[PDB]
Amino acid sequence: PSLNALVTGGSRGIGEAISMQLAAEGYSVTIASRGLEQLEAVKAKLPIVKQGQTHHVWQLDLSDVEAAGSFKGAPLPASSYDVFVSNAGISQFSPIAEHADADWQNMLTVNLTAPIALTKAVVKAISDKPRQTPAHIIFISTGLSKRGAPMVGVYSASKAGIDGFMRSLARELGPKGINVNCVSPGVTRTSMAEGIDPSMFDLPINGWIEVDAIADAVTYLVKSKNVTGTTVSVDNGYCA
C-alpha cells in the first residue's frame, strides 16, 4: 500500500514540505533536483510510517530536457509512479527589455519545457496501467500566472504555460484515471522570496505564507478523486 510519488525540487522550500507531508502519509517519495548532498540530507529525514515505504533521490538538472524526458539516472522507472508533483522552478525579476537571454531561456526550460518532457514520460509509462483510484499529476504554479505584474514577463509566461498544459491534460487523461491540477502559491517564506516582501503586493492577508500551507493543498489533492483541471490558489488573496 505505499505508493510512489515523484517530487521535483524536493531538496528545499515548498518541495521539501510537500515531500515531508507525502512521506508522513505513507508515500514512497523520490526527490529530484541538482543538489545531491542536499537531496540525501532531506531523504534521511523523510518519515517512514508504513512497511515497504522507501524514499529515493534523483540527481536531475531540468535544464537538460533530454535527461528529464528519458528518466536519465532515475532510481525507479517512470511506470512506478502514482503521484507526480512538478514543483521545481526558477523565478527571475527583470524589465523585459533588460532580461538576459541566457537567463529567461533557462527559466522557460526549467519551468515549462522540462516539465512537459517529464509529464510525457510519466503519462506514457502509466496511462494503461489498471488502477482502483486515480493517479495524480500536480503542477506548482504561481499567482502571477493569473494576475499580471511588472518585471515578471517570462516567469509568468512559463507558469501560465503550465496552467494551459494542465487544463488540456486533465481532459485528455481523466478517462485514463489520471487527475491533473495546479497548486498556486503566493509569496511564501522561501529562498525564492529573497529580496521581495508580501507588502509589495496588494494582499488581503498581509503576511508571509508558510511552506506548510502549500503542501497542505497538495495533500488535499492527492487524497481527492473528483478534482481535475483546476487550480487550488494558496496566495493570501493575491488573485482575488
Ligand X SMILES: NC(=O)c1ccc[n+]([C@@H]2O[C@H](COP(=O)([O-])OP(=O)(O)OC[C@H]3O[C@@H](n4cnc5c(N)ncnc54)[C@H](OP(=O)(O)O)[C@@H]3O)[C@@H](O)[C@H]2O)c1
The answer to whether residues 62 and 114 touch, using CB atoms and an 8 Å cutoff, is: yes
Neighbours of 185 (CB within 10 A): 27
Helix, strand and coil content of the chain, in percent to the nearest 5, comes to: 45, 15, 40
Q: Whole-angstrom Cα distance, residue 4 to residue 79?
A: 10
Span near a second copy by CB under 8 A; candidates 12-20, 32-40, 54-62, 146-154:
146-154
Instruction: For the CB of residue 90, give the shortest distance to a second copy in the complex, in Å.
Output: 15
- Nearest by Cα to 118 from 156, 72, 160, 157: 72
Local structure of 123: helix, strand or coil: helix
Question: What does the buried/exposed string (b/e) look like for 111-146 if buried means 16 or more CB atoms within 10 Å of the residue's CB?
Answer: bbbbbbbbbebbbeebeeeeeeebbbbbbbbbbbbb
* Contact window for ligand X (CB under 6 A) among 76-84, 119-127, 184-192, 200-208: 184-192
List 144, 182, 215, 218, residue binding a second copy (CB under 8 A): 144
Q: Out of 150, 191, 194, 200, name the contact with a second copy by CB under 8 A.
A: 150
Say whether residue 188 binds ligand X (CB under 6 A): yes
From the CB of 34, what's the least distance to a second copy, in Å?
Answer: 22
C-alpha cell at 5: 510519488
Query: Which position among 62, 121, 169, 217 is part of the footprint of ligand X (CB under 6 A)?
Result: 62
Site size for a second copy (CB under 8 A): 82
Give the closest residue to 238 by CA, choosing from 152, 148, 153, 127. 148
Task: Identify the residue among 25, 40, 61, 163 touching ligand X (CB under 6 A).
Answer: 61
**Residue 228 found at the interface with a second copy (CB under 8 A):** yes
Catalytic-residue membership of 155: yes
Backbone angles phi, psi at 107, to 5 degrees: -55, -45
Return the closest-CA partner of residue 123 out of 74, 180, 199. 180
Contact segment (CB under 6 A) with ligand X among 13-21, 76-84, 97-105, 130-138 equals: 13-21
Report the residue number, 89 or 198, with the smaller CB distance to ligand X: 89
- Per-residue x/- track, 79-108, ligand X (CB under 6 A): --------xxxxx-----------------
Task: Please identify, among the stretches 1-9, 28-36, 56-64, 110-118, the one whose residues bind a second copy according to the rule CB under 8 A.
Answer: 110-118
The Cβ of residue 26 has, within 10 Å, a number of other Cβ atoms equal to 16
| Catalytic residue annotation | 155
Enumerate binding residues for ligand X (CB under 6 A).
8-9, 11-15, 33-35, 38, 60-63, 87-91, 110, 140, 142, 185, 188, 190-192
